[PDB]
Amino acid sequence: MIRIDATPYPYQFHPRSTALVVIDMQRDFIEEGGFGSALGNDVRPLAAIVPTVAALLQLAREAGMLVVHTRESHLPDLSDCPRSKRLRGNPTLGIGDVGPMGRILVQGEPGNQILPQLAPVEGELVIDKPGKGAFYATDLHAQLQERRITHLLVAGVTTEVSVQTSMREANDRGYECLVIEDACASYFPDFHRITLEMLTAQGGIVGWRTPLAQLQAGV
Amino acid sequence: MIRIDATPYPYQFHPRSTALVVIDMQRDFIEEGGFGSALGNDVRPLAAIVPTVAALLQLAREAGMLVVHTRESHLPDLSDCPRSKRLRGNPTLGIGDVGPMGRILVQGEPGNQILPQLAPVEGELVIDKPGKGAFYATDLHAQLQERRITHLLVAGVTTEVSVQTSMREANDRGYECLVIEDACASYFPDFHRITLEMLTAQGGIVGWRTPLAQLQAGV
């Protein structure tokens, strides 16, 4: 079992009982021409972690861990998109409308694809999720139980939305979760660090956090 | 049909399709010597909201809305308590250990009870949940769908753990959620404030928030 330095105390895991979960690293959220920048978000902090996420993905692949990618996406007919989600924020361009990289948040559109630097390969799970939490309305929990996974390494975007939602759901379902702090990012510096602090408060209420360099030291 | 001034924009609901959800207002969180104290917290800040939660409960009862209470709790044999949750951190006492109000976080124990001043009455729904999120491993989604509930008024403790986890689950499931800002509290004032900001960021990404006085004005 590999033991690495973490907050709030060291985290130990066996690589073959562990999955890396890379959350929502999608072109529309991260690329300068994309829908995220069009809404006036500063995508630079999300772009900034891509080399770190790629290094974590390489570590996981070399260590023989299960790799799980998630995409926030809906069926082209929006049959899995609740009306509340479509109407939220009174948007000019909403879910299913044509944005700069195709229909917004729709399966098969260029904007919906994982960045090519972090693209899934054969033997990796890819989860299309209709919400922020990777476990809601997906078979992720079943797929991890079939593979006897107990431990999750968590990366991706954005820290305070899909990453924290997915880690809080994983914690509730009995997973031991380690969030890789420099392999996550937010549009808001107001939210990134304090989220990671929340997750590991009270002796690890949701789980653990560490930088990629501490994980690399262990393998 | 009832329109409330709220952040990030006004919230509209109908009592016939709205529930009040009161989260984890238990002696295990609010009274010294239970689960919250066992985690090393000073539980004293949560008591300050109990009169505001009581006024919110009265308002919902007088409006004839469905009321849902949640209790974080485990079966006495701990068969619904993941090993990860039991072994997390270094608590003074662990789940199921005997504290001054009985077995910590166990169903039927004095310290696990909802505060008498906030107790359920005949015709309210009471959800025992094994995780922080009110939807995981409960029938809450089915119970609301059977009553055609679309809107949730949300209150309780703690803001950054059970409240925000439950609200994020409810958002993913298509509910429209209004958190009553002064009917929530945290052990950590900064986590309370920033959680409320995250929930309504980006045009209402999780939902809405407003103080009790704005709700009272609308009814």
Swiss-Prot record, chains A, B:
Entry's Gene Ontology BP terms: amide catabolic process
Keyword entries, A-Z: Hydrolase
Mutagenesis or variant effect for residue 202 to E: Over 95% loss of the maximal triuret hydrolysis activity of the wild-type, but 10-fold increase in activity with biuret as substrate
pH dependence, entry free text: Optimum pH is 6.5.
InterPro entries in the record: Isochorismatase-like_dom, Isochorismatase-like_hydrls, Isochorismatase-like_sf
Catalytic activity from the UniProt record: triuret + H2O = 1-carboxybiuret + NH4(+)
Paired cysteines (S-S): none
EC number, as in UniProt: 3.5.1.-
Site (Essential for discrimination between triuret and biuret as substrate): 202
Regulation of this protein's activity per its record: Very weakly inhibited by biuret. Significant inhibition only at biuret concentrations greater than 50 mM.
Keyword Membrane attributed: no
Protein residues bound to triuret: 72, 132, 157-158, 162, 202
Phenotype for residue 187 to T: Less than 10% of the maximal activity of the wild-type
Active-site positions on this chain: 24 (proton acceptor), 129, 162 (nucleophile)
Consequence recorded when altering residue 35 to Y: Less than 10% of the maximal activity of the wild-type
Temperature dependency: The melting temperature (Tm) is 65 degrees Celsius.
Molecular functions (GO terms): hydrolase activity, acting on carbon-nitrogen (but not peptide) bonds, in linear amides; identical protein binding; protein homodimerization activity
PANTHER family for the chain: FAMILY HYDROLASE, PUTATIVE (AFU_ORTHOLOGUE AFUA_2G08700)-RELATED, PEROXYUREIDOACRYLATE/UREIDOACRYLATE AMIDOHYDROLASE-RELATED
SUBUNIT field: Homodimer.
Job of this protein: Involved in the degradation of triuret (carbonyldiurea), an impurity in agricultural urea fertilizer, and an intermediate of uric acid oxidation endogenously found in human urine and in prokaryotic metabolism. Catalyzes the hydrolysis of triuret to 1-carboxybiuret and ammonia. The product, carboxybiuret, channels into biuret metabolism and is spontaneously decarboxylated to biuret. Extremely specific for triuret with four, three and two orders of magnitude less activity with biuret, 1-nitrobiuret and formylurea, respectively.
Family: Belongs to the isochorismatase family.
Protein name (Swiss-Prot/TrEMBL): Triuret hydrolase TrtA
The organism of origin for this protein: Herbaspirillum sp. (strain BH-1)
Lineage: Bacteria, Pseudomonadati, Pseudomonadota, Betaproteobacteria, Burkholderiales
Encoding gene, per UniProt annotation: trtA
